[PDB]
Structure 1
Amino acid sequence: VETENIARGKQASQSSTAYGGAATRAVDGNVDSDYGHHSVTHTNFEDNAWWQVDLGKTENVGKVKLYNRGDGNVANRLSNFDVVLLNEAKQEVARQHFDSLNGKAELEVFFTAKDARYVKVELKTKNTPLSLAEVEVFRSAT
Structure 2
Amino acid sequence: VETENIARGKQASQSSTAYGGAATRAVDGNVDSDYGHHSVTHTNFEDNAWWQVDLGKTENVGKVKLYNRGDGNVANRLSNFDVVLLNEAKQEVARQHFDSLNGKAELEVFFTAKDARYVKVELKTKNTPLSLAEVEVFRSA
- TM-score class, shorter-chain normalisation, is over 0.9
How far the C-alpha of 1:110 sits from its partner, in A, is 0.1
What SS does structure 2 have at the residue aligned with 1:97? strand
TM-score in terms of structure 2 length: 1.00
- State the aligned residue count: 141
What SS does structure 2 have at the residue aligned with 1:82? strand
Partner Cα distance (2:124, 2:32) in 1: 25
Q: Deviations over 1:70-124 (max 9, x none)?
A: 0000000000000000000000000000000000000000000000000000000
Q: Structure 2: give runs of 5+ residues left out of the alignment.
A: none
What SS does structure 2 have at the residue aligned with 1:32? coil
TM-score in terms of structure 1 length: 0.99
How far the C-alpha of 1:47 sits from its partner, in A, is 0.1
Q: Structure 1: give runs of 5+ residues left out of the alignment.
A: none
1:1-142 alignment to 2 at 5 Å?
Answer: 1-141=1-141
Q: Deviations over 1:27-49 (max 9, x none)?
A: 00000000000000000000000
How far the C-alpha of 1:131 sits from its partner, in A, is 0.0
How far the C-alpha of 1:12 sits from its partner, in A, is 0.1
What SS does structure 2 have at the residue aligned with 1:128? coil
Partner Cα distance (1:97, 1:64) in 2: 13
Partner Cα distance (1:51, 1:103) in 2: 21
What SS does structure 1 have at the residue aligned with 2:36? helix
